[PDB]
Design an enzyme around this catalytic site. Structure first.
Site, PDB file in Angstrom:
ATOM      1  N   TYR A 130      37.706  34.408  44.477  1.00  0.00           N
ATOM      2  CA  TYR A 130      37.757  34.250  42.998  1.00  0.00           C
ATOM      3  C   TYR A 130      38.491  32.981  42.535  1.00  0.00           C
ATOM      4  O   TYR A 130      38.791  32.822  41.358  1.00  0.00           O
ATOM      5  CB  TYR A 130      38.308  35.523  42.308  1.00  0.00           C
TER       6      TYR A 130
ATOM      7  N   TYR B 187      34.896  49.842  51.964  1.00  0.00           N
ATOM      8  CA  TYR B 187      35.830  48.744  51.960  1.00  0.00           C
ATOM      9  C   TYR B 187      37.115  49.133  51.287  1.00  0.00           C
ATOM     10  O   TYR B 187      37.134  50.009  50.424  1.00  0.00           O
ATOM     11  CB  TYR B 187      35.207  47.509  51.261  1.00  0.00           C
TER      12      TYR B 187
ATOM     13  N   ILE C  79      31.251  37.916  46.305  1.00  0.00           N
ATOM     14  CA  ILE C  79      31.861  36.669  46.657  1.00  0.00           C
ATOM     15  C   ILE C  79      31.307  36.142  48.013  1.00  0.00           C
ATOM     16  O   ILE C  79      30.958  36.914  48.913  1.00  0.00           O
ATOM     17  CB  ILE C  79      33.392  36.735  46.703  1.00  0.00           C
TER      18      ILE C  79
ATOM     19  N   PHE D 103      40.070  42.139  53.083  1.00  0.00           N
ATOM     20  CA  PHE D 103      39.192  43.282  52.981  1.00  0.00           C
ATOM     21  C   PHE D 103      39.043  43.955  54.317  1.00  0.00           C
ATOM     22  O   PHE D 103      38.696  43.328  55.290  1.00  0.00           O
ATOM     23  CB  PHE D 103      37.784  42.899  52.489  1.00  0.00           C
TER      24      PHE D 103
ATOM     25  N   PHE E 218      43.704  46.718  45.546  1.00  0.00           N
ATOM     26  CA  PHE E 218      43.091  46.577  44.212  1.00  0.00           C
ATOM     27  C   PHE E 218      41.723  47.267  44.023  1.00  0.00           C
ATOM     28  O   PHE E 218      41.256  47.393  42.901  1.00  0.00           O
ATOM     29  CB  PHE E 218      42.999  45.084  43.822  1.00  0.00           C
ATOM     30  N   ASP E 219      41.077  47.696  45.113  1.00  0.00           N
ATOM     31  CA  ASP E 219      39.784  48.372  45.046  1.00  0.00           C
ATOM     32  C   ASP E 219      39.551  49.023  46.383  1.00  0.00           C
ATOM     33  O   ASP E 219      39.905  48.463  47.421  1.00  0.00           O
ATOM     34  CB  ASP E 219      38.687  47.350  44.779  1.00  0.00           C
TER      35      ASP E 219
END
Ligand SMILES: c1ccc2c(-c3cnn4cc(-c5ccc(N6CCNCC6)cc5)cnc34)ccnc2c1
Lengths: 320, 109
Positions: free
Chosen positions: B84, B28, B58, B101, B38-39
């Site tokens: 979130y 991902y 999530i 994502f 961010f990731d």
């Protein structure tokens, strides 16, 4: 599953100290909370087990959300990660409504804080210097801005005390409790009253200059050097562990108590006589004095203290 | 749900689907609505595993990925309620963030 390796894998990629986000947010539901191990500003600290490994968990309620935010952001700062700063692992959230808990998850250190460790054992010069040098190396790192594409600002800690420094298995220290920390880019009178410098106690701290917070930190660190030095044996003699000002104020001292001793009478912790019979403890005494001077501008910098302690170390053939 | 939009990028086998209790293995990349990443499991060259129905991730993730085929890759656009929320994540996800994502279902185990 090896937490260190998971953290190393993800920080090689980049940006964030700790685990990747999506991994961070699996943790609260999987941690086994074992027992309370101490206290942090605005939350209890517990030992938990995650994938069979001990970690520490600072637990906030949602009324202290802002503090969880602030502290976690600091720990996640770029280039913040450092052997003398407590290792951040993850932040996550569990539970429901008024009972919602916010977790700040970090390395766990079984020796506990400097307060616990000094009560537990006496020291030689080498261990004394290793605790002092490592602790000030952490502080100096906080205080020092680092330029990069993504930089680290100067940071003042604002709640330094022996209970907020951990002693690792290898005899070195790391600094924790960053919830009152200020970045160079706040209420004056915050922190632990016993360690507040005179200008914080009487609210004369100059809020126009970030440097005031840094200089405030150095007074507080001077008091910690005293705590540690008392525990170094010399001439077959050693003092019992005590907190600074133990003989001059009650436990959990008040602003009024501290103002009287530190602001008005301008007293400082006293040096046991036996210190004057040992060159190293004499030098430690001078270092403390120069850290905790009434006039902030006269206090030594963390870098100066670091360099002074390095010179003491190599002056006795001690490595680090 | 308009909360979790699923746009295929590359098709999967169209037959092997995650059942409750199976471990999904994915790659991902996660981005904010502006494009800031961010990731990314691809940047650390380690796929990420989670079990459908354990609520480890999530809700938008479980909902997006559950409807994906082994081998499929898809852009998941996930509203804050499915992610979130008002809280976000300190220093990483702001309040009320819609997240994007890019997800590939590699394997079920
Ligand atoms: C401030 C201080 C610490 C933390 C911590 C934190 C990380 N590790 N750790 C360990 C202890 C601890 C371990 C063992 C013992 N004993 C050992 C033998 N018998 C006496 C008691 C006592 C205390 C406490 N807190 C922490 C995590 C997050 N925010 C913080 C903010």
């Amino acid at each position: 599953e090896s937490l260190r390796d998971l953290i190393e894998q993800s920080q090689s990629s980049g940006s964030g100290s700790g685990l990747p986000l999506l991994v961070q947010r699996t943790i609260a539901k999987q941690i086994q909370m074992v027992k309370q191990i101490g206290k942090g500003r605005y939350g209890e600290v517990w030992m938990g087990k995650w994938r069979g490994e001990k970690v520490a968990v600072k637990v906030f309620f949602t009324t202290e959300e802002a503090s969880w935010f602030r502290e976690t952001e600091i720990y996640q700062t770029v280039l913040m990660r450092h052997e003398n700063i407590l290792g951040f692992i993850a932040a996550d959230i569990k539970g429901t409504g008024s009972w919602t808990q916010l977790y700040l998850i970090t390395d766990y250190h079984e020796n506990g804080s400097l307060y616990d460790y000094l009560k537990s054992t006496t020291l030689d010069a080498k261990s004394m210097l290793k605790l002092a040098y490592s602790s000030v190396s952490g502080l100096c790192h906080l205080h020092t801005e680092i330029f990069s594409t993504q930089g680290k600002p100067a940071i003042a800690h604002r709640d330094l005390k022996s209970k907020n420094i951990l002693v690792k298995k290898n005899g070195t220290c790391c600094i924790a409790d960053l919830g009152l920390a200020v970045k160079f880019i706040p209420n004056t009178r915050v922190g632990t009253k016993r360690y507040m410098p005179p200008e914080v106690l009487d609210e004369s701290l100059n809020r126009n200059h970030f440097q005031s917070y840094i200089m405030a930190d150095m007074y507080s660190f001077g008091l910690i050097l005293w705590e540690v030095a008392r525990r170094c044996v010399s001439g077959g003699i050693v003092e019992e562990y005590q907190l600074p000002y133990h003989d001059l104020v009650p436990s959990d001292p008040s602003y009024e108590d501290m103002r009287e001793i530190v602001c008005i009478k301008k007293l400082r912790p006293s040096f046991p006589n036996r210190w004057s019979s040992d060159e190293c403890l004499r030098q430690m005494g001078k270092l403390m004095t120069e850290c905790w001077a009434h006039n902030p501008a006269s206090r030594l910098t963390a870098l100066r203290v670091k360099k002074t302690l390095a010179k003491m170390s190599e002056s006795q053939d001690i490595k680090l | 749900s308009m909360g979790v939009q699923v746009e295929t990028i590359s098709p999967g086998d169209g037959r092997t689907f995650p059942k409750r209790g199976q471990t999904c293995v994915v790659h991902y990349t996660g981005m904010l609505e502006d494009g800031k990443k961010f990731d990314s499991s691809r940047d650390r060259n380690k796929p990420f595993k989670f079990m459908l129905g354990k609520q480890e991730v999530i809700r938008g993730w479980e909902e997006g990925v559950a409807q994906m085929s082994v081998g499929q890759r898809a852009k998941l656009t996930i509203s804050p309620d499915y992610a979130y929320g008002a809280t976000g994540h300190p220093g990483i996800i702001p309040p009320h963030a819609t997240l994007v994502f890019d997800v590939e279902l590699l394997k079920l185990e």
